C-alpha cells in the first residue's frame, strides 16, 4: 500500500484485441472499407 507480471498479461491481451478491432477499417485494396458502401453502389458481378 510489484504486480507488473500480472499487468503484462492484461496489457498484451488488450493490445491484441485492439489490433483485431482496428483492422476492420483497412481496404486491403478495395474501394471502401465498409461493406454496405460496396453493396449500395455496386451490382452483384
Amino acid at each position: 500500500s510489484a504486480l507488473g507480471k500480472l499487468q503484462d498479461v492484461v496489457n498484451q491481451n488488450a493490445q491484441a484485441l485492439n489490433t483485431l478491432v482496428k483492422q476492420l477499417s483497412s481496404n486491403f485494396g478495395a474501394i471502401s472499407s465498409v461493406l454496405n458502401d460496396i453493396l449500395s453502389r455496386l451490382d452483384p458481378p
Binding site: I31, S40, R41, L42, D43
Partner: protein, 49 residues
C-alpha cells in the same frame, strides 16, 4: 450543346432527381456507370453533382 474543347460544367444542386427517368428512357445509346451500378442511384444521396 457546347464544344468538346470548352465543355460546359453545371453544378447540380439539391433536388430530388430521379435517376430512373434517365436510366429507362431507352433513348440513350450509351449509359455506363462506373463507381456505382445504375439501379442503385435512385436510392442514394449526394451533396454535389
Amino acid at each position: 450543346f457546347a464544344s468538346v474543347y470548352a465543355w460546359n460544367r453545371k453544378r447540380i444542386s439539391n433536388c430530388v432527381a430521379d435517376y430512373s427517368v434517365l436510366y429507362n428512357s431507352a433513348s440513350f445509346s450509351t449509359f455506363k456507370c462506373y463507381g456505382v451500378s445504375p439501379t442503385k442511384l435512385n436510392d442514394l444521396c449526394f451533396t454535389n453533382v
